[PDB]
Amino acid sequence: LIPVSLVDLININIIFYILLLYTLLLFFIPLFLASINYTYHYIYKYYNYNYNFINNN
Amino acid sequence: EECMFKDTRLDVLPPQVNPLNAILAQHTAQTPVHRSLEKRLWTEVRATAVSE
């Protein structure tokens, strides 16, 4: 069979494929990280320090 | 799971407890009674000092 071949085991063409693929991955990481979570919105809205005052009398 | 889609700030409010009460209570428990009666003298003598 064709895919049963030692030439296709260390094929430099697929290595170029992998190289270009992961270089492009590296180039686009800062866009994959650009998703917003709404957890600090929750922290801002719900974190309420104690607003009661001290009154000895 | 739907914590973000609610407003439960009223279910959980900061308590109105005065921590000073817990402090003064520990102060009286450590002191004796004659010192408590002395403080009435310290206050009274301070009044007469302000009077004179």
Side-chain angles (χ1 to χ4, degrees):
Chain A
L1 267 59
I2 287 163
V4 186
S5 48
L6 296 167
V7 170
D8 293 333
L9 178 54
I10 307 158
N11 205 346
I12 187 60
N13 215 16
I14 291 152
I15 285 160
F16 290 154
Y17 191 75
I18 289 150
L19 281 151
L20 269 67
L21 196 144
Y22 286 101
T23 52
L24 261 71
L25 196 147
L26 279 171
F27 185 72
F28 290 122
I29 288 172
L31 309 183
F32 299 138
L33 302 176
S35 314
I36 284 156
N37 313 136
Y38 292 86
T39 190
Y40 290 106
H41 302 76
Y42 200 90
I43 294 161
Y44 187 91
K45 192 166 147 180
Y46 287 75
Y47 174 40
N48 293 316
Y49 62 102
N50 196 307
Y51 59 90
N52 311 127
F53 288 107
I54 309 306
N55 296 297
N56 206 323
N57 307 125
Chain B
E1 310 192 328
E2 288 197 330
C3 82
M4 297 260 187
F5 309 93
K6 298 182 170 59
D7 194 347
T8 55
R9 297 178 274 178
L10 308 180
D11 299 0
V12 166
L13 289 155
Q16 320 208 331
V17 175
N18 195 324
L20 200 62
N21 306 139
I23 288 151
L24 302 172
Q26 173 163 20
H27 187 53
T28 58
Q30 290 163 5
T31 53
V33 181
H34 64 97
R35 293 286 190 77
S36 191
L37 180 59
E38 207 182 359
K39 203 180 164 181
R40 289 175 190 177
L41 199 148
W42 289 94
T43 46
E44 172 160 359
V45 170
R46 274 187 204 171
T48 64
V50 168
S51 86
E52 70 198 346

